Amino acid sequence: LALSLTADQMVSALLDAEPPILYSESMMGLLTNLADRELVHMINWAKRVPGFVDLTLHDQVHLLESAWLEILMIGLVWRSMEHPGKLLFAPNLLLDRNQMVEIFDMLLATSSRFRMMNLQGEEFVCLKSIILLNSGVYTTLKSLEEKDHIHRVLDKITDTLIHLMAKAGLTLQQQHQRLAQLLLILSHIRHMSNKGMEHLYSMKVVPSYDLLLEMLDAHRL
Amino acid sequence: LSLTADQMVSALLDAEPPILYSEYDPTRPFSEASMMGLLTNLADRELVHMINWAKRVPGFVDLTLHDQVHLLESAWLEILMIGLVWRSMEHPGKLLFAPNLLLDRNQGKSVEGMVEIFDMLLATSSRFRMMNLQGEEFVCLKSIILLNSGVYTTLKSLEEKDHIHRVLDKITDTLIHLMAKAGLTLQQQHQRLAQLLLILSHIRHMSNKGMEHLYSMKSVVPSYDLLLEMLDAHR
Ligand SMILES: CCNCCOc1ccc([C@@H]2c3ccc(O)cc3CC3(CC3)N2C(=O)c2ccccc2)cc1
Ligand SMILES: CCNCCOc1ccc([C@@H]2c3ccc(O)cc3CC3(CC3)N2C(=O)c2ccccc2)cc1
């Protein structure tokens, strides 16, 4: 039924689902504490992405396990667009590359690319939902049915992105060029997340399946 | 940047490297103990061909030597991997490292960390199969990896980066043209383009895991100066 939404209805839903900007509460203690509070709101966001809560709870958790760090990063990048050379983790926590620096420079470069492209908010929220759905889709009959559903939702977000660029009055050549540019930034965000996740796992901190499930607040029947 | 889409596809098809073979050395038959040695030799021989393929990707040799090396240092494992997945597409459940080196998932449960990567490779092969990926699309995807993977990692640098994005846009055009010319609708074109490019996030993911597996041998990774030597040919 979420697959009957129009592109306009898909955009409004995603804009309405957007999480709040949190405030910061040892730089590394503060970043971890900020991440942990953001995760809760990301779970609330995820449930409002059309199509997501039609999946089993088991597969929602898996998507969330695979994607949460990418989602944290693209949001960091989004809200840093307007602050060249700085990362706005929170309104009370702007850091530059002087205050690890490899991932920091990668984040800054992503924010610079979003600036060069004049990434719009409507496009940004489509990109987050693609990240949520795409990041774990490579990992039974029921499993196969779920991946079919995920790809249908992915296709409709692609339709939506294109719709926005049409509305913006880009030519069809510019639409598919810009679509491609945006999706290629997602492979760099995947790269950035791989580095963080290796770092967390090295600690021997990564949100467990049970913690994510608890946050999803499953229905009681 | 002057080429048509047909011309782009023509050049990429023409530059395709050969399918290489694992050694048929009788003094070194296949066993689980000889495996990473055979696989390493094969990759080392493929890298040589990959260098000379890269130089034939339109736009690539327009870059500085320094940047060409940086792009290859970022992308070589992803390019090996996508070549592997393409070779394996028509053999469900198996990875076709070479025509004489076709492995299944339990042959992979020899080394620690290996089965996990094997399954991601097999999943990618599965995805190619159900998308019925075409050869002409494959070569576009491989060239996007080459140009894209190191680009996010100075006046000359700003010109380099402008140039790389203009070549990516041309490849994007070429991909759409391929799909247009087959007969896909505009909707199907944009949906397929998106499907194809999202696979590149997984390939990056796999390359990071594989890169993590390779350093876990502590032997293997081509250094920056080694790659530069390979690309820095005389005339
Ligand atoms: C839920 C798991 N709990 C265990 C903590 O895992 C964490 C801990 C910290 C981060 C922060 C964080 C916080 C908020 C944000 O919006 C974004 C980020 C982005 C991020 C890069 C990834 N990060 C860093 O510090 C950083 C920045 C620059 C270079 C190297 C590292 C994310 C996840
Ligand atoms: C040029 C750099 N020096 C050489 C050392 O790096 C190497 C050593 C070995 C491989 C093989 C290899 C060979 C050929 C191929 O086409 C592709 C691959 C793919 C690959 C994943 C990476 N691999 C493995 O064994 C493997 C497979 C599954 C799960 C875990 C590991 C590649 C690179």
Q: In 10 A of CB A16, how many CB atoms?
A: 9
Resolution for this PDB entry, in angstroms: 1.9
In chain B, where are the structural domains located? 5-231
In 3D, which of A160, A153, A146 has the Cα closest to residue A60? A146
Which residues share a beta bridge with A9?
A: none
Tell me the CATH number of domain A2-216, given options 1.10.3110.10, 1.10.150.20, 3.90.580.10, 1.10.565.10: 1.10.565.10
Do B196 and B175 touch, CB atoms closer than 8 A?
Answer: yes
Helix (H, G, I), strand (E, B) or coil at B102: strand
Q: Which residues of A are annotated as a binding site?
A: 38, 79, 199
Q: How far is B28 from chain A (nearest CA, A)?
A: 36
The residues, ordered by sequence, that sit 6+ positions from A202 with a Cβ below 8 Å of its Cβ are none
Taking contacts as CB-CB distances below 8 angstroms, the residues of chain A near B197 are 180, 183-184, 187
Q: In 10 A of CB B93, how many CB atoms?
A: 10
Burial A56-73 (b: 16+ CB within 10 A, else e): eeebbbbbbbbbbbbbbb
Question: Is residue A44 exposed (0-12), middle (13-18) or buried (19+ Cβ within 10 Å)?
Answer: middle
CA dist A221 to A26, A126, A218, B112, B214, Å?
44, 32, 9, 42, 48
User: Which residue's CA lies nearest to atom 28 of ligand 2?
Assistant: B118
CA distance B153 to B168: 16
Chain A with chain B: Cβ pairs closer than 8 A: 91
Fold of the CATH domain B5-231: Retinoid X Receptor (1.10.565)
Q: Cα A54 vs. chain centroid, distance in angstroms?
A: 19
A184, B191: Cβ pair inside 8 Å?
no
CA distance A185 to A163: 20
Q: How far is B58 from chain A (nearest CA, A)?
A: 18
Token digits for B130? 């159900």
CA dist B159 to A137, A182, B155, B166, Å?
37, 20, 6, 11
Which ligand is closest to the CA of B118, given by its number? 2
Angle at B162 between CA B71 and CA B65, to 5 degrees: 35
